[PDB]
C-alpha cells in the first residue's frame, strides 16, 4: 500500500491547498480592511495630536497590542478568570484536547505543571471516553430493539429497518447533542444559530479554536452552567467520535 | 465495568478538581498583569504627550483593539490569510490542534470551516493511521537489528523487545521533541521550557494558541516555516504511540 499512502498524502496536500485558497478568498479581504482601518485611526490621531510622532504612536499600538494579547480589556482602567469553576473548566479543556486557550498560562510553573497534567490526563480521559462510548452505544442499542421490532410488525424489509434504526440513531444523537446545545447556546450566549453550530462542532471535533467559549462571558451569574455544559462535552464526544470514525469508513468505501 | 466506569468518572472528576486547585493557586496571583501593563502604557504615554486627554487615549485604544480583533498587525506582507498562512490554518483544523492565533471573522468562513473539518479530520485521521503504520513497521524493521545486538549479549528476548521499544520512543522523543525545542529556542526567541510547552501542547493536539511557530515564509529560512507542518505530521504518530502506550499503562491500572 506504500504507493496508496503517497497518493493519500498528495490528496491531503491538495485538500490543504484547496482549503488555503477558499479560506484566503473568504478571510483575507477583511484582514486587509482591518489593517487599513488601523492605519486610518493612526493617521486621524496624528492629525489631532501634534505632540505625537508617527513612530511614537507606533510603539503605543505595539505595547497596547501585546497587553490585549495578554487578555487586557480596552473598556476598563481599574486594578476571576482563575476562579475554581473556570480553573476546573480549563483542566477540562486540556484532557479533552479541546484547548480553547481563551485564558493563557503566565507562570513558568503553570506551563511545566500543564505538561505533566496533560501527559497523564489525556490518555486517562481517552480511556473513560471509550468506557462512556460502549455504555452509551449499548443503552441506545437496547432502545432500538423496540424500534426495529415495530418495523418488522410494520412488515418493512429487515436490512432496510436496521439502517433505519441507525438512521433513527443519527437523528437521535444530532437532536440531543448537536441541535439541543445550539438552541441552548443561542439563548444563553446571545450567539446566532450559525455561531452556535460552529461552536458546538469546533468543540466536539476537539479543534477548540477559542474564538467562541460557552460560559466564558464575564457578566453571567451562572458559574455551574459552565460545568453542566462540560458533561454535554463528555456525552457528546463519543457520539462525534462515532460519526468521525464512520465518515472515515464512507471515505474508505469511496477509496 | 459499571463499578469501573463510575470509579473512573469519580477519579477523573477528582483529577479535574485537583488540577483546578493547582492551576488557580499558580495562575490567580498574576491574573491582572496584562491590565496592569495596559494601564502603565496609558499613564506613561499621557505623561509623555501633554496634548492627549485620558478619554481621547481611551478611544484610541478601543479603536486599535477592534482593528487588531479584525486581524490587523502592528507594523513598524504580514498577511495571516496569504496562501502560506491559510494553508497552515487549514492544517490546524484537520489535525484538530486549532491554535486560533488567527480567528475567522466571516460567517461564510465559519460555515465552510464546519464542512472542511467534518470531511477533513477523518481523511487526515485515515492518513495518520496509514502514515503511523508505514513508519511503525519501518521503525520495527530497525528495532529488530537493535534487538540482534541485545540478543548477542545474552539479554532475554522479551527484555530486549521492551528495551528496543523503550529505545524506540526515546529515539522518537530525541528526534522530534528535543530538536524542535532547540530549533524553536533559536528560531522563535523562546526559552527551552516555552519551546517544550509549545511542542507538547501541539503534539497532544490541545493547541492553546498562546505559542505558535506560524509557518508564514519570512527570511533566513522562510520555506522552513511551512516545513514545520511536516514535523507536526511526523511527530504526531510518535505522540499517538506514547499516548496509546500510556493508555495501555492506564489499561494496566
Amino acid at each position, epitope marked *: 500500500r506504500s504507493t496508496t499512502l503517497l497518493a493519500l498524502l498528495a490528496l491531503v496536500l491538495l485538500y490543504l491547498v484547496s482549503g488555503a485558497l477558499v479560506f484566503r478568498a473568504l478571510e483575507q479581504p477583511h484582514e486587509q480592511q482591518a489593517q487599513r482601518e488601523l492605519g486610518e485611526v493612526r493617521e486621524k490621531f496624528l492629525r489631532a495630536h501634534p505632540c505625537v*510622532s508617527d*513612530q*511614537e504612536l507606533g510603539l503605543l499600538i505595539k505595547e497596547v497590542a501585546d497587553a490585549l494579547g495578554g487578555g487586557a480589556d480596552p473598556e476598563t482602567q481599574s486594578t476571576s478568570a482563575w476562579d475554581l469553576g473556570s480553573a476546573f473548566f480549563f483542566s477540562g479543556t486540556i484532557i479533552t484536547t479541546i484547548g480553547y486557550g481563551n485564558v493563557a498560562l503566565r507562570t513558568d510553573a503553570g506551563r511545566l505543571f500543564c505538561i505533566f497534567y496533560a501527559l497523564v490526563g489525556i490518555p486517562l480521559f481517552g480511556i473513560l471516553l471509550a468506557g462512556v462510548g460502549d455504555r452509551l452505544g449499548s443503552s441506545l442499542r437496547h432502545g432500538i430493539g423496540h424500534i426495529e421490532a415495530i418495523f418488522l410488525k410494520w412488515h418493512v424489509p429487515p436490512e432496510l429497518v436496521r439502517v433505519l434504526s441507525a438512521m433513527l440513531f443519527l437523528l437521535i444523537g444530532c437532536l440531543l447533542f448537536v441541535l439541543t446545545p445550539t438552541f441552548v447556546f443561542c439563548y444563553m450566549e446571545d450567539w446566532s444559530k450559525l455561531e452556535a453550530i460552529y461552536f458546538v462542532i469546533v468543540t466536539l471535533t476537539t479543534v477548540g479554536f477559542g474564538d467562541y467559549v460557552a460560559g466564558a462571558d464575564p457578566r453571567q451569574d451562572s458559574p455551574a452552567y459552565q460545568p453542566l455544559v462540560w458533561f454535554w462535552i463528555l456525552l457528546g464526544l463519543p457520539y462525534f467520535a462515532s460519526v468521525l470514525t464512520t465518515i472515515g469508513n464512507w471515505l474508505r468505501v469511496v477509496s | 465495568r459499571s463499578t469501573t466506569l463510575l470509579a473512573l468518572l469519580a477519579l477523573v472528576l477528582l483529577y479535574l478538581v485537583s488540577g483546578a486547585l493547582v492551576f488557580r493557586a499558580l495562575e490567580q496571583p498574576h491574573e491582572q498583569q496584562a491590565q496592569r501593563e495596559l494601564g502603565e502604557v496609558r499613564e506613561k504615554f499621557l505623561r509623555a504627550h501633554p496634548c492627549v486627554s485620558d478619554q481621547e487615549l481611551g478611544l484610541l485604544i478601543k479603536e486599535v483593539a477592534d482593528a487588531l480583533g479584525g486581524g490587523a498587525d502592528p507594523e513598524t506582507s504580514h498577511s495571516a490569510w496569504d496562501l502560506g498562512s491559510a494553508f497552515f490554518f487549514s492544517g490546524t483544523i484537520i489535525t484538530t490542534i486549532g491554535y486560533g492565533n488567527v480567528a475567522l471573522r466571516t460567517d461564510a468562513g465559519r460555515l465552510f470551516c464546519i464542512f472542511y473539518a467534518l470531511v477533513g479530520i477523518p481523511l487526515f485521521g485515515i492518513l495518520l493511521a496509514g502514515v503511523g503504520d508505514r513508519l511503525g513497521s519501518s521503525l520495527r524493521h530497525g528495532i529488530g537489528h537493535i534487538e540482534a545486538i541485545f540478543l548477542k549479549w545474552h539479554v532475554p528476548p522479551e527484555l530486549v523487545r521492551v528495551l528496543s521499544a523503550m529505545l524506540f520512543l526515546l529515539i522518537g522523543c530525541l528526534l522530534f521533541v528535543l530538536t524542535p525545542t532547540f530549533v524553536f529556542c533559536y528560531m522563535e526567541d523562546w526559552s527551552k521550557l516555552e519551546a517544550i510547552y509549545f511542542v507538547i501542547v501541539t503534539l497532544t493536539t490541545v493547541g492553546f494558541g498562546d505559542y505558535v511557530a506560524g509557518a508564514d515564509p519570512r527570511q533566513d529560512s522562510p520555506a522552513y516555516q511551512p516545513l514545520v507542518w511536516f514535523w507536526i505530521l511526523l511527530g504526531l504518530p510518535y505522540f499517538a504511540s506514547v499516548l496509546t502506550t500510556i493508555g495501555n499503562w492506564l489499561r494496566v491500572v
Partner: antibody
Amino acid sequence: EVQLQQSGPELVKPGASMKTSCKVSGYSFTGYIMNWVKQRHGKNLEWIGLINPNTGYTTYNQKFKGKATLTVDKSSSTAYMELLSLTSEDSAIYYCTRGNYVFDYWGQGTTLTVSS
Amino acid sequence: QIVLTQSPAIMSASPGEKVTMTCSASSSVSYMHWYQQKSGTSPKRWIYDTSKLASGVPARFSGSGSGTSYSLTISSMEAEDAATYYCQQWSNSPPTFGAGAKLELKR
C-alpha cells in the same frame, strides 16, 4: 507668525563633523515634531529624521542612521542637527521643518559646503 | 521607501492656461501633500491632505486624487505660479517626496 530661524551657512573640511541649529518662535517648541530635510542642488528632497522636542524621541531615515544626531535644548527652544565624517556628498541645503504628517513651516535653509 | 514619481520633471504654461501635474505612488497612500519652491527660498506647504489649501495659497490652486495617483491643478496659470512643486507622503514612515516638477512660463 510661526518662524524657524536656522544658523548661517557652514564650510567644513572632509572628515570633520558639523552641527547646525534651528530656533523656533511664535509657537511652543515642545508641542510639535521637528524634522530635517536635505536638498542636494535643487533636486529630490530627502527626509533625514525627526526628534520630538518634548520627549527627545528620535527616528532616522536608514540612509542617515550613522550620519545624523538630532538634539534639542528645551530652554532655548532650539533644535540641532549634527552630521559626521563629512564627504562632498553631504554638500547640500539643510532645512529644519515642523510636522508629524505634513511639513507646515520650514526654516530658510542652511548651505553646507564640504571642501579642502 | 514609498516612491513618488512626478513626470514630466519640467513643464511650461502660458498665462491663463490650466495646468495639472501628477504624483504617482509605488503603492497606495491615504493623502498627498504639495510644496511650492522658488529658487533661493525654502519649500512652502502649498496643499496638504490632498485638497486642503495652506493659508496664503490662492483659490486658482486645487489638489485631488486617491490610492496611487494624486494631482495638483492651476485653473488659470499666473506669472507668480512659475516655481517647483513637490508632492510628499506620510502614510508610511519614512515620509518621501517626488523629485519635483519645475513649472516655467511660456513666451
